[PDB]
Amino acid sequence: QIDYRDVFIEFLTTFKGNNNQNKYIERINELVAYRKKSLIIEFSDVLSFNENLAYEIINNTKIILPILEGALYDHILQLDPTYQRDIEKVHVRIVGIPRVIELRKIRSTDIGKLITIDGILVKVTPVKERIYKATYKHIHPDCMQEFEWPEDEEMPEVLEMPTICPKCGKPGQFRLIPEKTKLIDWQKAVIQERPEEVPSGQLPRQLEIILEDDLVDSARPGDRVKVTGILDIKQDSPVKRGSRAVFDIYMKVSSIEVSSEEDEKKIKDLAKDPWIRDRIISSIAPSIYGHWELKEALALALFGGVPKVLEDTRIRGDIHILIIGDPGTAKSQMLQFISRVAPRAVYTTGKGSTAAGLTAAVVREKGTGEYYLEAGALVLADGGIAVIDEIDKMRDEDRVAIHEAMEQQTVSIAKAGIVAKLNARAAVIAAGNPKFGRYISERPVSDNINLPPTILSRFDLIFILKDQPGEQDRELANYILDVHSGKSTKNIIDIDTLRKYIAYARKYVTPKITSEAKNLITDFFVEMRKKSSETPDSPILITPRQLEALIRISEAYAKMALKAEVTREDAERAINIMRLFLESVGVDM
């Protein structure tokens, strides 16, 4: 009614950034350079420019937003006429709204308003095409005319074809012409409330969201996203009666963000510390007294070695950890911590997981009737960490399903007429108890660990945690009580920035192995194998996998400090933690 297009262009051209940079003229120019079709504007900036326009953007979104998009398209097309004939429509995507609604707490009064929802994305569909401007043909030996049907408008959520020909005025048959039809990319996804938000004793709620055009395929299942958009009622057949006055809610999304500049500077400044490795290790599960070898090993597992992908084969880069320990030894608490700190992790329990749930499930969809594949835990954990607590509670017949994923990092299935293989490039961090609950030193290591060697060799480090009371006891109790009282530790790396640091290291640091490090690894591996032949009753074998583990561990020691080369220091650190592991499983060098 009162047009804001000039207001919007003045906002774009003149809104000064932080250093008088013209934040949005820079974003516009960069958009045109890379030919991206979507301009993101912060809502706080709009409220800082024109309060009235910001109100219209939130409350009258459906119609004020395309007008702004048209003004932006015109301005862009003046800036560079070559945008025409490449992109016909741009988007004005509003990000960072003031108030976020908790998914469960939306009510009637939130429909039609532009709102934000924070939640975990659990499911997406393939990419489809939605018609927004149809072109029909009246089949009749008189008309035979093509016409755009959603005239002066746009095709609604429901699909409706005309009943009266607007080109002649005579009813009849209408055939859809796909040649002269205009479509937009379309994807349905489901987001559910953050686990910390689910009320006591209830199950998490879900909400269906719709992503169109360049929003399609912008996040993977498991990603915690912050969607901005508009709510509406889900119509499956509303033109017919017979009760059913009730509807579901969905969000048409205009903006989405997952999980970023000062963070890089901070992680770099952190890694200038000559003792940064010790810092990270002491930052691992800080409310747990002791278990430094385990904190080190878990930190290594967080960082991981370097995967080698070649012309014929590929070689695993991820580090697997196994902690077999007495009851009450902070195992599950540490595993909970690393699932929290890791940039991408999945938490599973040996008794809570199936063979199919951990790898891939073949589910018979009761709709079409046909069989389809669903990603299990190790596949969703691709690119991250999968934690298997209480791994001795898995059925062995179920547990062997992860052997392929642990070494070749693929889950390959051939079932119900479908043959496929998925990537399960996930690092396994596992914990369990010995055969008799606690470790029994009176018995050989073999019948006490009670795991096959085929899976033991898959583990780079295997520590046996014995809970033996000694002089440590008093210290322990004091530490625990200080934890209960609320006395947190100082000079630590907070879990969020530790996560950001791990993510950066994994994304950007690929350490190369130096010759001196390679010589130390070979020499220690030979010594390892010679000592291993001395006790063949041990179910802990020394295989080429252990040489690869020395590689991966030294690579991760380098990675942890952000180093681009694996120097002698990192090789020695690897040999030493390896030697600790071997001492615990009863192997003296």
22 lines the binding site for Mg ion (CB under 5 A):
no
DSSP letters spanning 262-319: HHHHHHHHHHTSTTHHHHHHHTSSTTS---HHHHHHHHHHHH----EE-SS-EE----
Site string for a second copy, 187-206 (x = CB under 8 A): --------x--xxxxxxxxx
**Which secondary-structure segment (H or E) carries 345?**
strand 345-349
Asked whether residue 432 is marked as a ligand-binding residue, the answer is no
Q: What is the rounded radius of gyration, in angstroms, for the C-alpha atoms of the chain? A: 30
- Rounded Cα–Cα distance for residues 62 and 103 (Å): 21
Asked whether residue 331 is marked as a ligand-binding residue, the answer is yes
Q: CB-wise, 56 or 389, nearer to Mg ion?
A: 389
User: Of residues 129-168, which lie at the interface with Zn ion (CB under 5 A)?
Assistant: 138, 143, 165, 167-168
Q: CB-wise, 181 or 454, nearer to Zn ion?
A: 181
Site string for Mg ion, 293-332 (x = CB under 5 A): ---------------------------------------x
Among 84, 259, 414, 508, binds a second copy (CB under 8 A): 414
User: Of residues 510-539, which lie at the interface with a second copy (CB under 8 A)?
Assistant: 513, 518, 521-522, 525-526, 529-530, 532-533, 539
Residue 286 interface partner, choices Mg ion, DNA, a second copy, none, CB cut-off 5-8 Å depending on type: a second copy
Phi, psi torsion values for 36, nearest 5 degrees: -85, 150
412 lines the binding site for DNA (CB under 7 A):
no
Interface region with DNA, contact rule CB under 7 A, candidates 128-136, 198-206, 246-254, 409-417: 409-417
Site string for a second copy, 13-52 (x = CB under 8 A): ----------------------------------------
361 lines the binding site for DNA (CB under 7 A):
yes
Among 20, 33, 261, 419, binds a second copy (CB under 8 A): 419
371 lines the binding site for DNA (CB under 7 A):
yes
Site string for a second copy, 235-264 (x = CB under 8 A): xxxxxxxxxxxxxxx---------------
Residue 332 interface partner, choices DNA, Zn ion, Mg ion, none, CB cut-off 5-8 Å depending on type: Mg ion
- Rounded Cα–Cα distance for residues 42 and 116 (Å): 13
- Rounded Cα–Cα distance for residues 460 and 318 (Å): 9
What single DSSP character describes residue 334? H
Q: How far is CA 539 from CA 243, 262, 301, in A?
A: 67, 49, 23
Residue 138 interface partner, choices Zn ion, a second copy, Mg ion, none, CB cut-off 5-8 Å depending on type: Zn ion
- Rounded Cα–Cα distance for residues 271 and 287 (Å): 24
User: CA triplet 471, 472, 476: central angle to 5 degrees?
Assistant: 140
148 lines the binding site for a second copy (CB under 8 A):
no
Shortest separation between residue 421's beta carbon and a second copy, angstroms? 6
Interior/surface letters 293-323, b for 16+ CB within 10 angstroms, e for the rest:
bbbbbbbbbbbbbbeeeeeeeebbbbbbbbb
364 lines the binding site for DNA (CB under 7 A):
yes
Q: How far is CA 184 from CA 219, 274, 320, 384, 521, in A?
A: 19, 53, 44, 33, 56
Shortest separation between residue 329's beta carbon and DNA, angstroms? 28
421 lines the binding site for DNA (CB under 7 A):
no
Q: Tokens 């071997």 appear where?
A: 582
What single DSSP character describes residue 343? S
Site size with DNA, rule: CB under 7 A: 13
Q: Tokens 């911590």 appear where?
A: 337
349 lines the binding site for DNA (CB under 7 A):
no
Dihedral (C-alpha) 240, 245, 248, 253: value to the nearest 10 degrees? 70
Shortest separation between residue 424's beta carbon and Mg ion, angstroms? 14
Asked whether residue 327 is marked as a ligand-binding residue, the answer is yes
Shortest separation between residue 15's beta carbon and DNA, angstroms? 52
Q: Are 143 and 168 in contact (CB under 8 A)?
A: yes
Q: CB-wise, 218 or 332, nearer to Mg ion?
A: 332
User: Of residues 433-452, which lie at the interface with DNA (CB under 7 A)?
Assistant: none
Asked whether residue 357 is marked as a ligand-binding residue, the answer is no
Q: Are 73 and 130 in contact (CB under 8 A)?
A: no
Asked whether residue 329 is marked as a ligand-binding residue, the answer is yes
Q: CB-wise, 173 or 519, nearer to Zn ion?
A: 173
In angstroms, the first-to-last Cα distance of the chain is: 84
Residue 83 structure tokens = 């945008």
- As annotated, the binding site includes 325-332
- As annotated, the binding site for ATP includes 325-332
Contacting positions for Mg ion (CB under 5 A): 332
